[PDB]
C-alpha cells in the first residue's frame, strides 16, 4: 500500500505531503496504481516549479517508495491550488483502489 500523509494547517493550506510505500497492485514494471500515483506526483511537482514561484523543499529516496514535499510559501495560491489538484487526483485513484493507496490527513 502507498500511504499519502497530508498535513493541512488550520486555514486549510497543505504544508506537507508524504507519499510512502509501494502500491503492491502489480509487480515492478506493471503496477497500475503505482503509475497512476507516480504520474500525478511527479507532474504536480513539475507544475508547482514550472508554473509558480514557489520552490518547495523536496526530499525522496532514490530507491523509490518515498517522497516528501514541504511548502515554503503557504501564501502562494497557485502552488496550493496545484497541491489540492494533486490531492483530488490521488483521491480519485483511492476511490477505486482503496486497498492500494490510502490518504491520511493531519
Amino acid at each position: 500500500m502507498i500511504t499519502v500523509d497530508i498535513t493541512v494547517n488550520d486555514e486549510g493550506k497543505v504544508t506537507d505531503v508524504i507519499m510512502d510505500g509501494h502500491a503492491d497492485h502489480g509487480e515492478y514494471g506493471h503496477d497500475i496504481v503505482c503509475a497512476g500515483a507516480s504520474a500525478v506526483l511527479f507532474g504536480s511537482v513539475n507544475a508547482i516549479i514550472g508554473l509558480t514561484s514557489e520552490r518547495p523543499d523536496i526530499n525522496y529516496d532514490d530507491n523509490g517508495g518515498h517522497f516528501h514535499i514541504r511548502s515554503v510559501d503557504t501564501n502562494n495560491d497557485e502552488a496550493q491550488l496545484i497541491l489540492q489538484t494533486m490531492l483530488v487526483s490521488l483521491q480519485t485513484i483511492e476511490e477505486e483502489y482503496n486497498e492500494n493507496i490510502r490518504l491520511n490527513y493531519k
Binding site: 515492478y28 503505482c34 503509475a35 507516480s38 504520474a39 511527479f42 507532474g43
Partner: peptide, 7 residues
C-alpha cells in the same frame, strides 16, 4: 526525472 514505477 519521472519514474513511473516509483511508488
Amino acid at each position: 526525472k519521472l519514474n513511473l514505477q516509483f511508488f
